[PDB]
C-alpha cells in the first residue's frame, strides 16, 4: 500500500546521502582508472544477462564497488575480483537464488579462485560495514513510475536504460545522487518518447525542479547521444531485446528544449 510510499521515498532520500562514494576517489587511485571502471561495469551487465539477474542486483553491485574503491586502493589485476565479489553480494541481498559461487569463478575464466572470491566478499562487507541496503537509481525510478499519467512502458524501459548508462561512467555521474540521476532519466526518457516533461507530481514529491535537474540532465543527454560510439556497449545490446520495447533503438532527441 502507498501508505508508506511517502515514508519510503523520504527514507530512501535520507539513506542515499549516507551511501555516497567519494567523488574524486578515482583520481586518488594510483593504479585504476575510470576507463577500467567502465570496462568492469559493462562486464557486470553482461554477467547479469548471462545469469538472468535483476537490474537492481547490477545497480547494487556498482554501489558496492564505488564505496569499496573509496576506502581501498585496488590494482588492475584485482579490480575484477572486487567486481565479482560485489555481484555476488548483490545477488545474495537482492535475488531469490543467487548463482553458486562456482559460477562467479567461471565468469572470470578462472582468473581468481573460489577462495579468493569468498574472502574478497568478506572484505567488502568489512569496508562497507554490512551496509548493503543502498538506494539506487533503479529504486528511485520505480518510485517515480507510480506518478506517470498514463503508465508508459517505453518510457519506463528507456528510463531504465539511461539509468544503466550512468553506472558506466563515474566521470560525470558520481557527483549526482541516485534520486537526481533517476529524475534526469525519467525526464529524458519521458521527453524522448512523448515530448513531455518532468511532472509537477514529482516536483512536489521530490522537491526537485526541472531546472535543478538540468546539470545532470545535460550530462545524461550527452551520454545518450554518444551511446552508440561508446567503447562499452553491453547496455545497448541489453535493451535491444524486445523484453525492453527495443528502446535503445529509439532516436535520441538532438536537443533538450531547456
Amino acid at each position: 500500500v502507498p501508505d508508506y510510499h511517502e515514508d519510503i521515498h523520504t527514507y530512501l532520500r535520507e539513506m542515499e546521502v549516507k551511501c555516497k562514494p567519494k567523488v574524486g576517489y578515482m583520481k586518488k587511485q594510483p593504479d585504476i582508472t575510470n576507463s577500467m571502471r567502465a570496462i568492469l561495469v559493462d562486464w557486470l551487465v553482461e554477467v547479469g544477462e548471462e545469469y538472468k539477474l535483476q537490474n537492481e542486483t547490477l545497480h547494487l553491485a556498482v554501489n558496492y564497488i564505488d564505496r569499496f574503491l573509496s576506502s581501498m586502493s585496488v590494482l588492475r589485476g584485482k579490480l575484477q575480483l572486487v567486481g565479482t565479489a560485489a555481484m555476488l553480494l548483490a545477488s545474495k541481498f537482492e535475488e531469490i537464488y543467487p548463482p553458486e559461487v562456482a559460477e562467479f569463478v567461471y565468469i572470470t575464466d578462472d582468473t581468481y579462485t573460489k577462495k579468493q572470491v569468498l574472502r574478497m566478499e568478506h572484505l567488502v562487507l568489512k569496508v562497507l560495514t554490512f551496509d548493503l541496503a543502498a538506494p539506487t537509481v533503479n529504486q528511485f525510478l520505480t518510485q517515480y513510475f507510480l506518478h506517470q499519467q498514463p503508465a508508459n512502458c517505453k518510457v519506463e524501459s528507456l528510463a531504465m536504460f539511461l539509468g544503466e548508462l550512468s553506472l558506466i561512467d563515474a566521470d560525470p555521474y558520481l557527483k549526482y545522487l541516485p534520486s537526481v540521476i533517476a529524475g534526469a532519466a525519467f525526464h529524458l526518457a519521458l521527453y524522448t518518447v512523448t515530448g513531455q516533461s518532468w511532472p509537477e507530481s514529482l516536483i512536489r514529491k521530490t522537491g526537485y525542479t526541472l531546472e535543478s535537474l538540468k546539470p545532470c540532465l545535460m550530462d545524461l543527454h550527452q551520454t545518450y547521444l554518444k551511446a552508440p560510439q561508446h567503447a562499452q556497449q553491453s547496455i545497448r545490446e541489453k535493451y535491444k531485446n524486445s523484453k525492453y520495447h527495443g528502446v535503445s533503438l529509439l532516436n535520441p532527441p538532438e536537443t533538450l528544449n531547456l
Binding site: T33, M36, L40, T108, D109, T111
Partner: peptide, 5 residues
C-alpha cells in the same frame, strides 16, 4: 572473461 586493463 579475464578483463585486460
Amino acid at each position: 572473461r579475464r578483463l585486460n586493463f
